Amino acid sequence: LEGRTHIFKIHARSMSVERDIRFELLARLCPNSTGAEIRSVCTEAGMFAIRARRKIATEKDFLEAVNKVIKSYAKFSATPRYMTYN
Amino acid sequence: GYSFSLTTFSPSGKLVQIEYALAAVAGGAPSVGIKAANGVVLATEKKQKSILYDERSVHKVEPITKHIGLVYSGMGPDYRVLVHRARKLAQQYYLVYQEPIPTAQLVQRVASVMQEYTQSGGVRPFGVSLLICGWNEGRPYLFQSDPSGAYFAWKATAMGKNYVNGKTFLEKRYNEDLELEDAIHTAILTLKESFEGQMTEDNIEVGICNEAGFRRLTPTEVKDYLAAIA
Amino acid sequence: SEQIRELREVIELPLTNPELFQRVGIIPPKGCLLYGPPGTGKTLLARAVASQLDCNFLKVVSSSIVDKYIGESARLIREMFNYARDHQPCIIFMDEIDAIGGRRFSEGTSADREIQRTLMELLNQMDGFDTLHRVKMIMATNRPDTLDPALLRPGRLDRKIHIDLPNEQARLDILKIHAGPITKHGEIDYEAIVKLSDGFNGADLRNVCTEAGMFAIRADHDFVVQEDFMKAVRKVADSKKLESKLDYKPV
Amino acid sequence: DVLPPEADSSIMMLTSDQKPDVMYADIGGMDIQKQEVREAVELPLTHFELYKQIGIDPPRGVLMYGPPG
Amino acid sequence: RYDSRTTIFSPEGRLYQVEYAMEAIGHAGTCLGILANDGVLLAAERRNIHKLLDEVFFSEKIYKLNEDMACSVAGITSDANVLTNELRLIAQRYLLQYQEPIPCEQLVTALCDIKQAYTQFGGKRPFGVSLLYIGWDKHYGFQLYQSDPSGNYGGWKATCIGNNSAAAVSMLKQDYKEGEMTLKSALALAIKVLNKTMDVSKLSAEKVEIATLTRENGKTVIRVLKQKEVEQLIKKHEEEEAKAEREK
Amino acid sequence: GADREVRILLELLNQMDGFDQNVNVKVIMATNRADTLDPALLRPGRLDRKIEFPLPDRRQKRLIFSTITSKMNLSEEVDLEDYVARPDKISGADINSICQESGMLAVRENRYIVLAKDFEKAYKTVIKKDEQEHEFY
Amino acid sequence: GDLVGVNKDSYLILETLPTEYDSRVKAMEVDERPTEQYSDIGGLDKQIQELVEAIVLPMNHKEKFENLGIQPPKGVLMYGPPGTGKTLLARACAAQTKATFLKLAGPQLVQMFIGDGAKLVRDAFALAKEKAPSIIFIDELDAIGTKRFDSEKAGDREVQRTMLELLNQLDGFQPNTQVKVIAATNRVDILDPALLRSGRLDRKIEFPMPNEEARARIMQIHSRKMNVSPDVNYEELARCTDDFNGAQCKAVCVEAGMIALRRGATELTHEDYMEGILEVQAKKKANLQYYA
Amino acid sequence: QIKEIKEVIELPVKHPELFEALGIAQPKGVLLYGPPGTGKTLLARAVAHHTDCTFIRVSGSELVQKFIGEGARMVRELFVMAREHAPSIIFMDSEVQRTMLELLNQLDGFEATKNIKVIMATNRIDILDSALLRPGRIDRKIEFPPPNEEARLDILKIHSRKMNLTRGINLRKIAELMPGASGAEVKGVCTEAGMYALRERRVHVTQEDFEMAVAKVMQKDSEKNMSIK
Amino acid sequence: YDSNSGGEREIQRTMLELLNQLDGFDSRGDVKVIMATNRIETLDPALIRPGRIDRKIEFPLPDEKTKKRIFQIHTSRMTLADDVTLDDLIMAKDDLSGADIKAICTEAGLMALRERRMKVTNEDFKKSKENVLYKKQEGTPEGLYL
Numbered sequence A: 001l002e003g004r005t006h007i008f009k010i011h012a013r014s015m016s017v018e019r020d021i022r023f024e025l026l027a028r029l030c031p032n033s034t035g036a037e038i039r040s041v042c043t044e045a046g047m048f049a050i051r052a053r054r055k056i057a058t059e060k061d062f063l064e065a066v067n068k069v070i071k072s073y074a075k076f077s078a079t080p081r082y083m084t085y086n
Numbered sequence B: 001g002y003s004f005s006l007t008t009f010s011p012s013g014k015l016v017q018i019e020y021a022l023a024a025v026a027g028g029a030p031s032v033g034i035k036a037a038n039g040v041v042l043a044t045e046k047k048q049k050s051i052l053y054d055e056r057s058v059h060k061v062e063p064i065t066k067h068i069g070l071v072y073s074g075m076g077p078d079y080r081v082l083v084h085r086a087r088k089l090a091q092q093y094y095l096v097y098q099e100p101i102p103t104a105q106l107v108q109r110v111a112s113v114m115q116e117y118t119q120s121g122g123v124r125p126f127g128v129s130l131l132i133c134g135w136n137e138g139r140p141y142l143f144q145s146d147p148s149g150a151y152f153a154w155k156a157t158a159m160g161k162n163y164v165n166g167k168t169f170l171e172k173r174y175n176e177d178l179e180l181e182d183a184i185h186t187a188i189l190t191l192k193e194s195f196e197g198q199m200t201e202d203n204i205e206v207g208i209c210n211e212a213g214f215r216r217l218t219p220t221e222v223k224d225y226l227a228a229i230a
Numbered sequence C: 001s002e003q004i005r006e007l008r009e010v011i012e013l014p015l016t017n018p019e020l021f022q023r024v025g026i027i028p029p030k031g032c033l034l035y036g037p038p039g040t041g042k043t044l045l046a047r048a049v050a051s052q053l054d055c056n057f058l059k060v061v062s063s064s065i066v067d068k069y070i071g072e073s074a075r076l077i078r079e080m081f082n083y084a085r086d087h088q089p090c091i092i093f094m095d096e097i098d099a100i101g102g103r104r105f106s107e108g109t110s111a112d113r114e115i116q117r118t119l120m121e122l123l124n125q126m127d128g129f130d131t132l133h134r135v136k137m138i139m140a141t142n143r144p145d146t147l148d149p150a151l152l153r154p155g156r157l158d159r160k161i162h163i164d165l166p167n168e169q170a171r172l173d174i175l176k177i178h179a180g181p182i183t184k185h186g187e188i189d190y191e192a193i194v195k196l197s198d199g200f201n202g203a204d205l206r207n208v209c210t211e212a213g214m215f216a217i218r219a220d221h222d223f224v225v226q227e228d229f230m231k232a233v234r235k236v237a238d239s240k241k242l243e244s245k246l247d248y249k250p251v
Numbered sequence D: 001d002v003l004p005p006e007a008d009s010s011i012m013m014l015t016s017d018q019k020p021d022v023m024y025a026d027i028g029g030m031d032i033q034k035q036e037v038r039e040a041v042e043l044p045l046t047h048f049e050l051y052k053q054i055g056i057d058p059p060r061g062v063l064m065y066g067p068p069g
Numbered sequence E: 001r002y003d004s005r006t007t008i009f010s011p012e013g014r015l016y017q018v019e020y021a022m023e024a025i026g027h028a029g030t031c032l033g034i035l036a037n038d039g040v041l042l043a044a045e046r047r048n049i050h051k052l053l054d055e056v057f058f059s060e061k062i063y064k065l066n067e068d069m070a071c072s073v074a075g076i077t078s079d080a081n082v083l084t085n086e087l088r089l090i091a092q093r094y095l096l097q098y099q100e101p102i103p104c105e106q107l108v109t110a111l112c113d114i115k116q117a118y119t120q121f122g123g124k125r126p127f128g129v130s131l132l133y134i135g136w137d138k139h140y141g142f143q144l145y146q147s148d149p150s151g152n153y154g155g156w157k158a159t160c161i162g163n164n165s166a167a168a169v170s171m172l173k174q175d176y177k178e179g180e181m182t183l184k185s186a187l188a189l190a191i192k193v194l195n196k197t198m199d200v201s202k203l204s205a206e207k208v209e210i211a212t213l214t215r216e217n218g219k220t221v222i223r224v225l226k227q228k229e230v231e232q233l234i235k236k237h238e239e240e241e242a243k244a245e246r247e248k
Numbered sequence F: 001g002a003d004r005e006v007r008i009l010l011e012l013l014n015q016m017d018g019f020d021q022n023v024n025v026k027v028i029m030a031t032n033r034a035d036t037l038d039p040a041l042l043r044p045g046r047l048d049r050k051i052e053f054p055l056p057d058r059r060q061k062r063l064i065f066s067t068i069t070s071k072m073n074l075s076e077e078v079d080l081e082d083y084v085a086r087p088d089k090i091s092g093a094d095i096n097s098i099c100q101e102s103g104m105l106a107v108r109e110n111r112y113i114v115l116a117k118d119f120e121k122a123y124k125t126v127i128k129k130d131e132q133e134h135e136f137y
Numbered sequence G: 001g002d003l004v005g006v007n008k009d010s011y012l013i014l015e016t017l018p019t020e021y022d023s024r025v026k027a028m029e030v031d032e033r034p035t036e037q038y039s040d041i042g043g044l045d046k047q048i049q050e051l052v053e054a055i056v057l058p059m060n061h062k063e064k065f066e067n068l069g070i071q072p073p074k075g076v077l078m079y080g081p082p083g084t085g086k087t088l089l090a091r092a093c094a095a096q097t098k099a100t101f102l103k104l105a106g107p108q109l110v111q112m113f114i115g116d117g118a119k120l121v122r123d124a125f126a127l128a129k130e131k132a133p134s135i136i137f138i139d140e141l142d143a144i145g146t147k148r149f150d151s152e153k154a155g156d157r158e159v160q161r162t163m164l165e166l167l168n169q170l171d172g173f174q175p176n177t178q179v180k181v182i183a184a185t186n187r188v189d190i191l192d193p194a195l196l197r198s199g200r201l202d203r204k205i206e207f208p209m210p211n212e213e214a215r216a217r218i219m220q221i222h223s224r225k226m227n228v229s230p231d232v233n234y235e236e237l238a239r240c241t242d243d244f245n246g247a248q249c250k251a252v253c254v255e256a257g258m259i260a261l262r263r264g265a266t267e268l269t270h271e272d273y274m275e276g277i278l279e280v281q282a283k284k285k286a287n288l289q290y291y292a
Numbered sequence H: 001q002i003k004e005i006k007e008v009i010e011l012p013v014k015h016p017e018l019f020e021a022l023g024i025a026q027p028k029g030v031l032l033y034g035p036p037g038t039g040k041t042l043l044a045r046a047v048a049h050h051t052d053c054t055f056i057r058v059s060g061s062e063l064v065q066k067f068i069g070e071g072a073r074m075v076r077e078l079f080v081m082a083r084e085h086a087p088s089i090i091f092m093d094s095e096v097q098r099t100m101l102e103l104l105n106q107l108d109g110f111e112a113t114k115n116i117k118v119i120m121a122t123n124r125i126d127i128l129d130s131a132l133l134r135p136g137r138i139d140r141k142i143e144f145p146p147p148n149e150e151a152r153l154d155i156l157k158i159h160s161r162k163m164n165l166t167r168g169i170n171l172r173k174i175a176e177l178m179p180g181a182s183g184a185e186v187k188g189v190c191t192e193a194g195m196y197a198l199r200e201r202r203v204h205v206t207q208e209d210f211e212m213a214v215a216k217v218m219q220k221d222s223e224k225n226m227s228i229k
Numbered sequence I: 001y002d003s004n005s006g007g008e009r010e011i012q013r014t015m016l017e018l019l020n021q022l023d024g025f026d027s028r029g030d031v032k033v034i035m036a037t038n039r040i041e042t043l044d045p046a047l048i049r050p051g052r053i054d055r056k057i058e059f060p061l062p063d064e065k066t067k068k069r070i071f072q073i074h075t076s077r078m079t080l081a082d083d084v085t086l087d088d089l090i091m092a093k094d095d096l097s098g099a100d101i102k103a104i105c106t107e108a109g110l111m112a113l114r115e116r117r118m119k120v121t122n123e124d125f126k127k128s129k130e131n132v133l134y135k136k137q138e139g140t141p142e143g144l145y146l
């Protein structure tokens, strides 16, 4: 989990983000991934930081980055839409 | 506790093992059955595999009622079982109704029984089509079942080797109106049509159904008739 | 001797004199198939024919034909049959036909269709348009059941002759051919071996005499004692435990 | 020079004699197929004008089917 | 290792066996029921028209089930014969319950549940048989229904059989009659349906079947009609073919 | 797999099914069983001589006898018609096997005289198998 | 099939080249001959004896065989677990028996490019008929000895060409007793029955598991040259081992070298042997879920 | 279908600018799928013989593992033919997927002599790789059914015309006896009928020769006692 | 393929050179590379993995709001009796491509201009869409959906 938090630190410091956010929630959101895919997450939060005019990346830019890459980019854009659990 | 069928449809929709059971029937033997105007004549040609076998032991022509004769299409060890079933079923009709059962009732009931045996799978379906006859209420009748639970009705009907050849030979040779000895005449004519040359009193074996009732003939009178029946 | 004499009749006669066939007029036959248990000396009998005619022997192990290509197998078949068309008194021998003969089932596979086409190179090219002239075909297999019934019609191969397990003068006389170069004495109870044997081929009597001699090497008996032969019977009749499915009866 | 043919396909018709001869004056029982092949090969090859006064066709291919033997 | 599927979905969202049952349906003979207010008819096709038979059965597709209700059939025969024995057991059971005949729909829904129990479980082959329903009641009069292997049932006015009857249904949408309960309009109409869609040359009577079911004075009689009026329906319908070729 | 070879279907189509019109009279193809073709061979139009060739029968069977037994020496008076009056089904090529087993059986005796044992032993070397008769159903 | 010198002009066969060296084979000839005396083979000493009586004495004295007058042996099969030691007869008979040690492997008979199985085999043994006609070590013969099939779109019909060409060129065709076939298969059940019969490989020499003291013994062979503290009881070690082959005796002993190498000890320690005894619990995992 | 041929071909032959005066594009090929050419070899050959340059039937599938891709990778050699012989019409019957894709590389809107007329024809199931089976790739898609008794009657007039004829014949009976050919069962009935008049010394060819010819051509139904369904 | 050596070990080497040269070394900098397929299954995932290929963009078939502009602009250059409604064509076919819009919007002009009519009736759109779309799996065979 925490090597992934370390890579969150690596690709977090290497770009313009906001230093008021967390990453353990994202390491929970990443079960099985490479740090290159973590970099794809960080660049995708960069893409939401392009859409809105953002240079201090919020938590939600990473939230939509992971919900993009792992969920809305797994096969199509729909792995969920059933509750049944919660 | 298996058997939640065994039979699936083909991707064509057909049922393969039933067709292989029909292959097991048609790859067997040729015999003959002819309905005449008065009774129904059934005939086999039972030659032994060796020169040793007693022909007084096993008998292909078998009555179920005193006015109902029957033969089959396949193997004896199945045939004795389903015969025993049909015997007991006819006894059930006679216990209910105290009256000799019409043949079509055995057609519906026994054909439904064999249809049940096609249904499930832990068992094979019986590779037998039946040749049923009985002189019930003035009219004699001749009914041809299948392994697959259905049935038919013929003026004459054969099965097995050269079945289209013997069948067309009945279509050419026989007609609507004959007699009993005429039916035995064209029955031997279609019997030796594809049988071997050695056909004695003990090879052929005939059972008839007069309106007076079933009569399993003996090799005495078979030797009296089939000693050059033309 | 029935196989020697009658197989001698179907093989040796139309090269010694094919004109007695022509005094009759009728064409001589073509070939046959030997069967029975494996290793009973089908190859050894073929080597006896190889000693008898001494002329034109083309003997193929007949499973090294399919390398990984399709018609390469056929092209080797055509080349061998053209060489057989070249030389007049050619003799063919083939063994383990089941890896190259096979059986045609419904086509759902992808590697013995090659054996079907190659098998059809046999179906045509044992007959062809031109018949083979003085080109005999000696066939030997272990299971003659799984071969094609299209092959099993006569004319191509005339007859399927059975080779059995060795009888007691086969065990004995073949054993005494194997008891030749042996530094024995007046000790050799052969029926200790043979009656303690239960059917053993010529190479199994190589096993009996050879490993009995290996027990003669045990404690370095430079002579040959009889009791080592019974030891060889113990070892080999003990070693028959791993072998089953003793027969294949064709057709 | 120009040579319009080239060597062969594979075997090229055997060219002389290897024709095994037993079909016209000698054959055991194929009168339907001998009769029809005769009708469909030999009578086309000479009587082309019988394909004219009735005006029928040239012949084409054919198939046989029979067990091995 | 021996379960074929017997009770399973496609890995997507459909069903395996029922499709192939419908593949077994369309390769059969063809029946039809017509729009008639005063009774209702059915037309059927004699499979196995070989000549050496007996034909002493007086019905092959028709099964007059209770008193005033019958049914055609299409599919495996004796399975459906079990369904007729069971069906007459159920409606006749209902009659034993009430001394009143069935209202003719809940019987059909019951049989759809019977096939349906084989669709969900049972580890077996369901019935690939679709069949017809005719009758009369106190609440809708003469009725027309269609069975399915899916456990569905259709409340019809003009029914459908498989590939031999798809163009028939296109004809019935093309030749929809309405208001006319005159049975002979449906007789020449159905003689046109089997005249085209069946490949029987000139519509031989021994390849076809017609049976009606008409209200008669409190009896609701069923006419398993003979063949001579079928012959004059053939001559009448080919006379209508002469009327069709008047325009040349 | 080897669908590339499966070039053969489009080969026989593209080269045969489509007409030459003037050349190659009657390519002849032959084998008992046909699960092979027919839309491409026995066709509307194509069938100019594309004719199925079924089996022979009797009334020439003793002429198979008559022709092939002229090869051997025939002794003097051992007759031949005596054996086809019966179900034999001994497909042409096999009467030659009867003549080779029978005649060469007399060559085991080295006698060109042919007698009825050559008939009977060539009913005991040939098609006698399978099951001569089952003869029921 | 020879390299010859030919004139560019007259096209005359001028000289024979002394450069027919044969790629891979002449490289397959082990020229180093590493030493292995029979002190290393612990636990298979009866197999040493039947080994020598089977193999070493046909190299020395065929008069021991043919004054008695039968035959020499033909091929010996070595099998068992793959840590019991099949290299030990190869290097032991290499160094100890003074003959040209030739080796051969299993996958050294499979090249993508095909056309015959009769060049590397036939020029390998026909190579070895002169400069190595006494010792040939086939290794992993079970990798190519595959039980044949009658099936489609699966399996190999090749290999066996190399192996029946091995038997073919070697035996029967001028049968000379100038060759010793040594094969060490890990398993036997994949091999054909036509490869083991009576003269293909005459013997079936199985190698059982090192019971206790061949584990401590061969483990001590690994710890012979390493600096070992005398606080080591090999019977404690190999006794608390269960189901180890000498691949795992070696694995535990070298892993005692590496676990002893982690902290930087001056010598091997018995704890580091005991740590090797459980080199990461074989398959590790260790979830104590459900076992409580 | 011939009128559809007039649409797909002849208006881009005769008046392409009167069609493009509207401002839309042209269809290219009909995909004549049915019994092995059903009015197809002599049909599209006989008709498009009469366009005087504009039909170069390269036939496009003959040595298919050699005419396609072997030597002509980007089979566009054919397309250089069809451009530099701008009155032309191309016909065809893993490489097939490749060359398919280069067809789609040219004919998806990137085209010199406008549409040519590329045509493929096969039969019985169209389960080739469906990246061709987009309709924007093949516009016209025409099944070939069995012709009707009117059309079987007309072809019966066509190939019955050139024979030695006997007066007093009904052809509607014979076309009625047809189950529906692929074009010319007519021709087989004519050839077997005249063959019946040939083996026999006959120079009048009555309808009986034709009916025995039908009986030779059309046969084979059997095997009762399987009347399930 | 035909013009080829050993198949499994030819394009493995070329696509291997693509894997090395495409997105291995030789500093990308600013070199845009866009590739396109229709299916996905034969793709070796060694290029699908990130670093090499970053975005994988699918394409759906268009919805009815976007259909009206394609139907309209494909009909923007033709004389048309505008009393007919395109919304039947926009609603009816559920999984059209734009080539279906193209083929119908040309085909109806083939049916009106088939009879020299400059403007198009609705039944020419009926014959147009029934001419373009074929083998509509609705009833017949099974049509279990009803």
Ligand SMILES: Nc1ncnc2c1ncn2[C@@H]1O[C@H](COP(=O)(O)OP(=O)(O)OP(=O)(O)O)[C@@H](O)[C@H]1O
Pocket (backbone or CB within 6 Å): C037, C038, C039, C040, C041, C042, C043, C044, C045, C046, C140, C141, C142, C170, C174, C201, C202, C203
């Ligand atoms: N009938 C026999 N007469 C003389 N020797 C025999 C006989 N049968 C077997 N042998 C001896 O057996 C040995 C092997 O014979 P052979 O090679 O024919 O076995 P095989 O029959 O080919 O076995 P397989 O075909 O199962 O491998 C030969 O050396 C031969 O001397």
Ligand SMILES: Nc1ncnc2c1ncn2[C@@H]1O[C@H](COP(=O)(O)OP(=O)(O)OP(=O)(O)O)[C@@H](O)[C@H]1O
Pocket (backbone or CB within 6 Å): F017, F018, F039, F040, F041, F042, F043, F044, F045, F046, F047, H035, H036, H037, H038, H039, H040, H041, H042, H043, H146, H147, H148, H151, H152, H155, H181, H182, H183, H184
């Ligand atoms: N239904 C039809 N309509 C018009 N012409 C037809 C029809 N059927 C056949 N023809 C005529 O028959 C001739 C040959 O047709 P075609 O080439 O399709 O035969 P085919 O069906 O391909 O036969 P096969 O596939 O058996 O070779 C054509 O010239 C054509 O004019």
Ligand SMILES: Nc1ncnc2c1ncn2[C@@H]1O[C@H](COP(=O)(O)OP(=O)(O)OP(=O)(O)O)[C@@H](O)[C@H]1O
Pocket (backbone or CB within 6 Å): H104, H108, H134, H136, H137, I037, I038, I062, I066, I069, I070, I097, I098, I099, I100
């Ligand atoms: N305005 C539009 N809205 C939606 N779809 C459109 C529009 N215009 C065109 N299209 C669709 O997009 C496609 C554009 O051509 P395209 O390159 O996709 O064809 P293609 O070469 O067959 O593609 P491929 O080779 O990838 O299958 C057309 O087939 C059309 O259906």
